Amino acid sequence: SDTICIGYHANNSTDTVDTVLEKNVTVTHSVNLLEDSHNGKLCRLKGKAPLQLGKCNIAGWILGNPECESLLSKRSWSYIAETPNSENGTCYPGDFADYEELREQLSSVSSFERFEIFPKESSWPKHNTTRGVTAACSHARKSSFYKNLLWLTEANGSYPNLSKSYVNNQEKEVLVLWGVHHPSNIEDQRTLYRKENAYVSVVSSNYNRRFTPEIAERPKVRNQAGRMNYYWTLLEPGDTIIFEANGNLIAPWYAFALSRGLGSGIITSNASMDECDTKCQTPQGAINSSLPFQNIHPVTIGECPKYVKSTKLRMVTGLRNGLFGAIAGFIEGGWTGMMDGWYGYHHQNEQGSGYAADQKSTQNAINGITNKVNSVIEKMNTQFTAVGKEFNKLEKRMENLNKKVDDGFLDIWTYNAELLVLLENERTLDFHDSNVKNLYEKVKNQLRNNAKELGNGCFEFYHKCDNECMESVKNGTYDYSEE
Amino acid sequence: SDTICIGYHANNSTDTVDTVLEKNVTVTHSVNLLEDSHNGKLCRLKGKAPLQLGKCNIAGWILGNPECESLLSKRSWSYIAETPNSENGTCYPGDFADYEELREQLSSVSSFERFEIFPKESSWPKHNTTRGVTAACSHARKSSFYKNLLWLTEANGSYPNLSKSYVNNQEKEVLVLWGVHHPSNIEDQRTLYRKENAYVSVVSSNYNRRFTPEIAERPKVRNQAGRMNYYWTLLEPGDTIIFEANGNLIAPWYAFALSRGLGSGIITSNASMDECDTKCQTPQGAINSSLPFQNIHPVTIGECPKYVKSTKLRMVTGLRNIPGLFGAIAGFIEGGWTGMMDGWYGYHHQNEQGSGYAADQKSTQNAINGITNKVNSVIEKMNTQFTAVGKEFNKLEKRMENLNKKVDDGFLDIWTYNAELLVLLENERTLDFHDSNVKNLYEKVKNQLRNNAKELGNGCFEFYHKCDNECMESVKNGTYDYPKYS
Amino acid sequence: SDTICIGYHANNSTDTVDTVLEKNVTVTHSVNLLEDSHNGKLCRLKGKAPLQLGKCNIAGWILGNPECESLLSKRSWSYIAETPNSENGTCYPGDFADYEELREQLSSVSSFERFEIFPKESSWPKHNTTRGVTAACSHARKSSFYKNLLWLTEANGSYPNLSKSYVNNQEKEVLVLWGVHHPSNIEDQRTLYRKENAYVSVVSSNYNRRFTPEIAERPKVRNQAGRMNYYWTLLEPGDTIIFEANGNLIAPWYAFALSRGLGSGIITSNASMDECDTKCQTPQGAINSSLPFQNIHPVTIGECPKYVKSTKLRMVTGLRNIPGLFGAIAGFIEGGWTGMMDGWYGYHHQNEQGSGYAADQKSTQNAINGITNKVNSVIEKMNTQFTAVGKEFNKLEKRMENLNKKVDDGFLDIWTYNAELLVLLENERTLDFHDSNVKNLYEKVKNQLRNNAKELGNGCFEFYHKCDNECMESVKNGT
Ligand SMILES: *[C@@H]1O[C@H](CO)[C@@H](O[C@@H]2O[C@H](CO)[C@@H](O[C@@H]3O[C@H](CO[C@H]4O[C@H](CO)[C@@H](O)[C@H](O[C@H]5O[C@H](CO)[C@@H](O)[C@H](O)[C@@H]5O)[C@@H]4O)[C@@H](O)[C@H](O[C@H]4O[C@H](CO)[C@@H](O)[C@H](O)[C@@H]4O)[C@@H]3O)[C@H](O)[C@H]2NC(C)=O)[C@H](O)[C@H]1NC(C)=O
Ligand SMILES: *[C@@H]1O[C@H](CO)[C@@H](O[C@@H]2O[C@H](CO)[C@@H](O[C@@H]3O[C@H](CO[C@H]4O[C@H](CO)[C@@H](O)[C@H](O)[C@@H]4O)[C@@H](O)[C@H](O[C@H]4O[C@H](CO)[C@@H](O)[C@H](O)[C@@H]4O)[C@@H]3O)[C@H](O)[C@H]2NC(C)=O)[C@H](O)[C@H]1NC(C)=O
Ligand SMILES: *[C@@H]1O[C@H](CO)[C@@H](O[C@@H]2O[C@H](CO)[C@@H](O[C@@H]3O[C@H](CO)[C@@H](O)[C@H](O)[C@@H]3O)[C@H](O)[C@H]2NC(C)=O)[C@H](O)[C@H]1NC(C)=O
Ligand SMILES: *[C@@H]1O[C@H](CO)[C@@H](O[C@@H]2O[C@H](CO)[C@@H](O)[C@H](O)[C@H]2NC(C)=O)[C@H](O)[C@H]1NC(C)=O
Ligand SMILES: *[C@@H]1O[C@H](CO)[C@@H](O[C@@H]2O[C@H](CO)[C@@H](O)[C@H](O)[C@H]2NC(C)=O)[C@H](O)[C@H]1NC(C)=O
Ligand SMILES: *[C@@H]1O[C@H](CO)[C@@H](O[C@@H]2O[C@H](CO)[C@@H](O)[C@H](O)[C@H]2NC(C)=O)[C@H](O)[C@H]1NC(C)=O
Ligand SMILES: *[C@@H]1O[C@H](CO)[C@@H](O[C@@H]2O[C@H](CO)[C@@H](O)[C@H](O)[C@H]2NC(C)=O)[C@H](O)[C@H]1NC(C)=O
Ligand SMILES: *[C@@H]1O[C@H](CO)[C@@H](O)[C@H](O)[C@H]1NC(C)=O
Ligand SMILES: *[C@@H]1O[C@H](CO)[C@@H](O)[C@H](O)[C@H]1NC(C)=O
Ligand SMILES: *[C@@H]1O[C@H](CO)[C@@H](O)[C@H](O)[C@H]1NC(C)=O
Ligand SMILES: *[C@@H]1O[C@H](CO)[C@@H](O)[C@H](O)[C@H]1NC(C)=O
Ligand SMILES: *[C@@H]1O[C@H](CO)[C@@H](O)[C@H](O)[C@H]1NC(C)=O
Ligand SMILES: *[C@@H]1O[C@H](CO)[C@@H](O)[C@H](O)[C@H]1NC(C)=O
Ligand SMILES: *[C@@H]1O[C@H](CO)[C@@H](O)[C@H](O)[C@H]1NC(C)=O
Ligand SMILES: *[C@@H]1O[C@H](CO)[C@@H](O)[C@H](O)[C@H]1NC(C)=O
Ligand SMILES: *[C@@H]1O[C@H](CO)[C@@H](O)[C@H](O)[C@H]1NC(C)=O
Ligand SMILES: *[C@@H]1O[C@H](CO)[C@@H](O)[C@H](O)[C@H]1NC(C)=O
């Protein structure tokens, strides 16, 4: 007897997917949508390396703590990496005004340039510029001080009025930092500033603040009962800043001209830097930006996949290894032997035997599933952003609001991703079930009376069929010689 | 021989939709789910017109900058519209305390009424009330000052202690604003206030602050080295506010009795206002709220379609236009019928009495009702809370500004993804549905005409027996007398 | 002649669901996905009862308003419940610094220990410790004061310098509260403090502030033109706090050692407490947390279903009830069988030995298992973290308040839309599924009886050969 069979692919694949109706379905071909690995390194974003702070936090780096590396020239960075629990910040204890705010300002800086705003050798001719050192800020076992500030003191029994101004002719924003010293007793205030009641005044076109030292005994920090409060402001292009004091000023020595870029952010990381590039950086390492979802870390920088709590997001592209009754229905098994398509034919006649795929229906199915995967992947809108937000000890409400935002996006993206994969995996299998059922009915319609339907997807020809009648039948031309 | 064919509609439509399996599919009918047009005007929200500030920002308007129009009547507004050239604010340089907070609080009011809190002519018998004008607040080429504040100065060589109180009897909140002058040198401090050390004190039942002038040389803004700081508080009904100073006070002259309503916001727009109503205002113009999505602007006020980055959201309602999951459409019935123009699905008959198309009304009306219900569900399930998306943050609120941007951008990402895929997937489902309606019509006829006709394999049945117009009507209305012909 | 029929289940159910194509479809079985009821009481979260403040707000409780002495002995809680009449707070008028911030801090406290930081009887030997009472803080018709603070005044014509330190040896954070008095006139300043210009100083390793009294005429609140501003700080373990003053200090008397727990929150509720447990508390009452969605209240504490504006989220699990896409149900098999009560799909046989219905167990069991897996996926994929939705903002934080409102409202719109459409679309898919299982059941037998029977067109086959009960069982068993 002669036979033409319609059937589908099977292979040695062990891939499993989940579907809305069935868990743990072994499938022939599949695509993973979930980034779940990282390279364990810090990499370049947008071509530039990050600003690496090493032993310091931003306070110590921006103030110039003697244990931190100085930036002498103009530099650029993609994001900032500080390590956890950096211990070199404000070596002299005090309050850093709007510290988190300043950290956020430095996260959106494309270029950054240190310059000597009030040069130490020439700006203070009637004050002592070389005695302002302390053991709290020592380096290599010798006392020192912040490299960007200058602790002025009395000279020859007097601390005269000082008035120092600076005009921003840099055609960009200038970040100016300064300090105010608060002694632990009036003896030290008298010794250093030759006055009991001093003041500091700092003004620009849009900044204006007056400081008066407050003297009291305090618990010792870094063996210091005194305090220095740190302050900063952004001087607009063309604007001037005026410093006026008769005591206690920790004066600007170096300041920073800066250029703004894309908003970036700060990564806390114990990971080391490497000679890699990336479109998306996480605290434990860089991740590929090709898939729509990732489960490595919710706080990322770059053009990043959405963070999900999922551990598996596997999308079926092939077949069971149903809704339309053929696959796992009346055609109960796949053909490992057919290795050139998803759907096709098996012939058995006197002229020879073997499997062959139907190129038309397989190519249509391959092209459609490809469009489906590309839509799940490429419809994902991806802007360059920095997720992280920093809040101080009196911003717990803002911190919890930020956590409620990140967590809600996580719940929405996790649920929708899980269910999308479950439902569309079901749809993809029905699509294959319907492509083979339509292939069967196409041949049945052509083979109207010339064959018996065996009920297994196979038709036994009455008309004697060689290897020549079939090529016309699989090419869909038939002339409906009874044995 | 006589023949009855099953087929589906085709027309001259050029609409294209995308589906999960195929992009750019030509279809007979489709619906747009994406608002992509606005009317270019500012409209009334919740029945009320916005406050239009024109040349002024809220600061200049509320202080009474001499270049701003004063409000003589009691009025109401749903939101505030300032223009990109709103440049007239604090004409005398200084800090406006909690400015953004005041902008948000003033953005929608049930009633608003300016009134003379401390009449200039009668409240300060021992101070100079006529010398406090400056070129920084010039008007008509003459020095001037804010119309709602009064710059008190010394009179006859003395600036006496002042203590002025006001009881809120307005049975609503009163917005009281005031200022503090900070001279640029001690000579000016002496000349105007006859003291080097002055203070200002302002107290209510829940507001309590003391100000002392700080004198220093400062860079000149609008040719002023001095500074004036502006302050405000909302005095609750029945409460008292007390001003105490011996110098430097920029005193309240007019205040505002107001009732605030549900929180609104500020629109920055160069669009003109019109006598239109809307549920959703956008900076470039009002938009309809009938569709679930819009791509006009992310920052809107009202009950608004969700903002998406999509450029096209077209939902198929009809069929592939050919002038498949179930094998019929674009399968064995490979083409549509331009000739059938009164339904989606139907028949072509040819017998000795004539030929022509006819739509199957039952199955067509069923499909129209389902697709209608499907489109209405996609549209009407969209809950949109009244919201004012915009948020203003000052130079020290950058983290807050980025948190607000992360919220708007996260919602944009969720809604764009969900909108695109919903249309991609439901477009596929709608086409499967039409394909399955044609299969069931074809199979319905095949069951009726069991052996009395040959299946040609293209949607057509070749009758063995002669079939007239009562027989053809019998097949199309599903009362085919099968035994009669066997 | 002998007949075998394929059909589907029908019952007396009146449940209705909506589908994307058709509203209000009567179905045989369904599951509710929407929690829409609550028990009307306050319950224990994570095993611990809430702190009920009753007549007091948090200011009155933490400061020790004399009308809150019944709250001085509560030490552990899961969340805080204030009532709509919580009116006893700062009985002496003034500003409470970072009050909302402190309310959020106390929302995340596991254990709480009040302790006498500066004992009134022994810490102030040269000041008057018994005169600092006022009618603004009355108790039992006698002037009084906060039970956790001490209003120090001059003794015998002088208010001497004071310096008091405290070392946190509690091995946990110590919440320290204090105040600064601001009289309305300089006569009262001299009377209480023997000084016109005083100062207060409070310092630790990370806190540093100096306060100066401001003397001015003020409107009277609770008959007081004076003011007391309230302050606090969290003292780190091992750190020292130093109080220094020569006047106007309202000194700490008791402080609080606290241990943080899971971040929780504050509920305002008129509901009474009961001896119940819940994984989710709402202001009107506790709710079940089993379903993925609830419509009771958007501001919840616990592991909570997502809040939706929906009034009905019913998912069909069974079939159209007749007491489609694949053409059988409501197609050529126009009705369901109330008689078949042992399955969703099955057969009716009629031959010379008898008649009756029989469910096809394989196809029914396969369908029941698949629909079960689907219902469980919709439910169990819902990630539910312990959260406290609520956020409190003061009169100068409207922008923050409206940003929090935009966040809550955005999540509500996303979840409502997605829930409604998921149910409409999966209800359609579920009904399509049943239509397809009966079509495949019909087609299986039609292939089996290729020439031996006439297809009647209603799901029934008229046997040509006489078919007995072993022939019938083989057709129903596919043998
Ligand atoms: C309650 O709290 C108040 C605070 O509000 C206390 O008031 C303060 O008390 C302290 C001590 O009681 C006062 O400090 C003293 O100041 C005098 C005045 O010194 C000045 O006057 C002289 C010239 O006019 C000169 O002697 C001084 O020179 C000092 O400073 C320079 C700095 O370079 C240095 O070179 C010198 O060597 C001197 O150090 C200065 O110009 C000062 O003379 C006192 O010295 C005494 O104390 C120190 C330390 O104890 C000791 O070393 C000396 O031997 C000497 O015995 C001292 O420093 C402060 O001025 C007060 N402040 C106010 C506002 O009144 C009050 O005392 C507290 N009461 C109680 C009961 O505790
Ligand atoms: C370091 O910093 C301190 C504080 O910042 C400065 O101290 C101030 O210095 C100014 C300038 O000398 C002082 O102002 C002066 O006040 C004198 C007194 O004026 C009052 O009394 C007279 C007569 O009773 C009245 O006519 C007058 O209207 C006032 O009521 C004035 O007479 C001075 O004017 C002289 O200088 C100006 C220019 O500056 C001329 O135009 C005049 O013609 C006149 O010759 C002057 O205005 C001020 O009092 C000081 N403050 C304090 C708190 O003492 C230091 O000067 C500064 N530098 C140094 C080196 O210490
Ligand atoms: C920069 O960072 C380093 C590392 O954190 C700092 O060195 C550390 O300084 C702390 C504080 O002084 C030391 O702790 C103290 O040790 C001393 C002596 O043992 C003791 O008296 C204190 O009670 C406390 O235990 C710590 O041991 C020390 N560690 C090392 C490795 O040196 C340094 O101070 C920082 N310098 C600047 C300028 O920021
Ligand atoms: C600033 O103060 C320092 C220390 O008080 C002065 O340093 C002294 O300088 C002389 C030379 O002029 C040396 O002989 C001393 O040994 C230095 N003392 C110390 C402790 O190093 C310094 O001179 C002062 N600055 C100016 C400009 O006079
Ligand atoms: C109101 O706004 C106008 C325009 O912003 C101001 O006029 C400008 O004033 C500056 C002086 O600082 C000049 O440099 C410009 O040439 C002016 N522009 C025009 C078009 O005249 C005006 O001063 C503002 N007035 C007040 C009271 O705020
Ligand atoms: C005007 O009011 C002030 C304050 O009420 C009176 O007293 C002065 O107050 C300031 C504080 O702002 C102190 O620095 C002064 O020392 C006070 N003057 C004294 C004590 O004589 C002032 O007396 C009042 N003016 C008149 C004319 O009564
Ligand atoms: C505790 O709260 C009550 C009510 O909120 C406070 O005031 C009572 O209010 C009404 C009159 O307005 C009456 O019940 C009593 O006359 C009021 N009581 C008193 C003592 O005035 C009460 O003052 C609050 N107590 C404290 C210490 O804050
Ligand atoms: C999933 O299927 C694989 C075979 O494909 C099997 O080895 C494994 O145990 C299954 N896991 C289950 C049923 O949980
Ligand atoms: C103070 O005297 C020293 C003496 O060595 C001198 O070097 C310094 O320049 C003087 N300070 C001045 C002139 O401001
Ligand atoms: C889309 O379809 C239209 C109409 O058939 C056709 O003209 C156009 O070339 C197609 N291509 C794209 C990219 O839209
Ligand atoms: C808004 O809808 C109305 C009613 O359908 C319509 O007349 C109007 O043109 C629409 N406007 C815009 C801008 O779409
Ligand atoms: C100052 O004195 C003149 C003449 O006595 C008088 O006209 C004027 O009103 C006085 N100033 C004030 C504020 O009354
Ligand atoms: C107020 O000041 C002006 C100067 O601008 C002066 O001419 C006038 O007389 C003064 N009036 C009083 C009452 O002092
Ligand atoms: C069906 O068509 C026949 C032929 O004209 C007609 O006589 C009969 O009334 C129709 N039955 C219906 C519409 O139910
Ligand atoms: C829905 O259908 C039922 C019949 O099962 C009917 O009683 C009811 O009135 C219909 N409408 C609503 C809103 O329930
Ligand atoms: C404190 O003051 C009260 C009343 O003012 C008085 O009865 C008491 O004896 C005083 N005690 C001391 C120690 O001064
Ligand atoms: C101080 O006040 C107490 C309060 O009772 C009093 O007994 C004593 O006599 C007063 N005088 C002195 C010097 O202690």
Q: What CATH number does the domain containing B68 carry?
A: 3.90.209.20
Q: Are residues A86 and A135 in the same domain?
A: yes
Distance of CA C192 to CAs B210, C195, C215, Å? 22, 8, 13
Most ligand 17 atoms within 8 A of CB, residue of C130, C156, C194 to mutate: C156
Contact between residue A445 and residue A479 where contact means Cβ atoms under 8 Å apart: no
3-state class (DSSP) for residue C103: helix
Nearest to B392 by CA among B42, B59, B146, B62: B59
Q: Which atom of ligand 9 is nearest to the CA of A125?
A: 14
Cβ neighbors of A94 (< 8 A, separation 6 or more) are A179, A182, A227, A228, A229, A230, C208
3-state class (DSSP) for residue A314: strand
Cβ neighbors of C62 (< 8 A, separation 6 or more) are C102, C106, C148, C175, C177, C256
Measured CA angle at C328 (ends C325, C330), to 5 deg: 85
Burial profile B103-139: b = 16 or more Cβ within 10 angstroms, e = fewer = bbbbbbbeebbbeebbeeeebbeebebeebbbebbbe
Q: For residues C183 and C132, what is the distance between their CA atoms, to the nearest angstrom? A: 13
Report the residue of chain B nearest A366, measured CA to CA: B21
Q: Are residues B345 and B221 in the same domain?
A: no
Residue type for position A78:
S
Nearest to A419 among C244, C371, C377 (CB): C377
Region at C464 (left for phi over 0; alpha for psi -120 to 50; beta for the rest): alpha
Burial profile B342-373: b = 16 or more Cβ within 10 angstroms, e = fewer = ebbbbbbbbbeeeeebebbeebbebbeebbeb
Q: How far is the CA of A368 from the centre of ligand 8 (A)?
A: 29
Technique used by the depositors: X-ray
Q: For residues C327 and C440, what is the distance between their CA atoms, to the nearest angstrom? A: 11
Q: Are residues A106 and A204 in the same domain?
A: yes
Q: Please tell me if residue B410 touches chain A, with a CB cutoff of 8 Å.
A: yes
Q: Are residues B21 and B73 in the same domain?
A: no
> What sign does the CA torsion over B215, B218, B224, B228 have?
negative
Tokens at A99, concatenated: 């510290």
Tokens at A377, concatenated: 């992947």
Q: Are residues B30 and B162 in the same domain?
A: no
Q: Provide the shortest C-alpha distance from residue C170 to chain B (in Å).
A: 35
Instruction: Name the domain boundary from B250, B271, B292.
Output: B271
Q: For residues C294 and C307, what is the distance between their CA atoms, to the nearest angstrom? A: 5
- For chain B, the C-alpha Rg in angstroms (whole number) is 37
Q: For residues C295 and B261, what is the distance between their CA atoms, to the nearest angstrom? A: 26
- Is the shortest distance between the CB of B284 and ligand 11 below 6 Å? no
Residue A442 Cα to chain centre, angstroms: 51
3-state class (DSSP) for residue A155: strand
- Is the shortest distance between the CB of B39 and ligand 11 below 6 Å? yes
Q: Which atom of ligand 10 is nearest to the CA of B16?
A: 2
Q: For residues A367 and B21, what is the distance between their CA atoms, to the nearest angstrom? A: 8
Instruction: Name the domain boundary from B242, B271, B300.
Output: B271
Q: Are residues C35 and C105 in the same domain?
A: no
Q: For residues A417 and A409, what is the distance between their CA atoms, to the nearest angstrom? A: 12
Number of domains in chain C: 2
Q: How far is the CA of C22 from the centre of ligand 15 (A)?
A: 13
Q: Are residues B55 and B33 in the same domain?
A: no
Give the DSSP letter string of A193-255: HS-SS--EEEE-SS-EEEE---------BTTB-SEEEEEEEEEPTT-EEEEEESS-EEEESEE
Tokens at C380, concatenated: 């169990």
Helix (H) or strand (E) holding A403: helix A396-446
Task: Give the single-character DSSP code of C49.
Answer: P
Tokens at C148, concatenated: 């956790």
**B240 burial class (0-12, 13-18, 19+ CB within 10 angstroms)?**
middle
Number of helices (H), then strands (E), in chain B: 6, 33
Q: Provide the shortest C-alpha distance from residue A303 to chain B (in Å).
A: 13
Residue A392 Cα to chain centre, angstroms: 23
Q: Please tell me if residue C239 touches chain A, with a CB cutoff of 8 Å.
A: yes
Nearest to B412 by CA among A299, A414, A306: A306
- Residue listed under structure tokens 């551990």: A311
Q: How far is the CA of B122 from the centre of ligand 12 (A)?
A: 14
Nearest to A28 by CA among A334, A323, A322: A334
Q: Are residues C267 and C361 in the same domain?
A: no
Q: Which atom of ligand 7 is nearest to the CA of C65?
A: 27
Q: Please tell me if residue C303 touches chain A, with a CB cutoff of 8 Å.
A: no
What is the number of other CB atoms lying within 10 angstroms of the CB of residue A185? 13
Contact between residue A383 and residue A36 where contact means Cβ atoms under 8 Å apart: no
Picking from C6, C79, C104 by the largest number of A CB atoms within 10 A of its own CB, the best residue to mutate is C104
3-state class (DSSP) for residue B367: helix
Nearest to A426 by CA among A23, A32, A29: A23
Q: For residues B25 and A112, what is the distance between their CA atoms, to the nearest angstrom? A: 52
Q: Are residues B73 and B42 in the same domain?
A: no
- Is the shortest distance between the CB of C416 and ligand 7 below 6 Å? no
Domain of B202, in residue numbers: 49-271
Chain C neighbors (3+ CB pairs < 8 Å):
A, B
Q: Which atom of ligand 4 is nearest to the CA of A156?
A: 28
Cβ neighbors of C55 (< 8 A, separation 6 or more) are C67, C68, C83, C85, C86, C87, C88
Instruction: Name the domain boundary from B215, B236, B271.
Output: B271
Nearest to B399 among A104, A163, A430 (CB): A104
Question: Strands B51-52, B80-82: parallel, antiparallel or unpaired by DSSP?
Answer: parallel
**A75 burial class (0-12, 13-18, 19+ CB within 10 angstroms)?**
middle
Q: Are residues C137 and C225 in the same domain?
A: yes
Q: Are residues A109 and A44 in the same domain?
A: no
Q: For residues C255 and B295, what is the distance between their CA atoms, to the nearest angstrom? A: 56
For chain C, helix, strand, coil in percent to 5 are: 20, 35, 45
Q: Are residues A188 and A236 in the same domain?
A: yes
| Torsion angles phi and psi, residue B95, rounded to 5 | -95, 135
Task: Give the single-character DSSP code of A139.
Answer: E
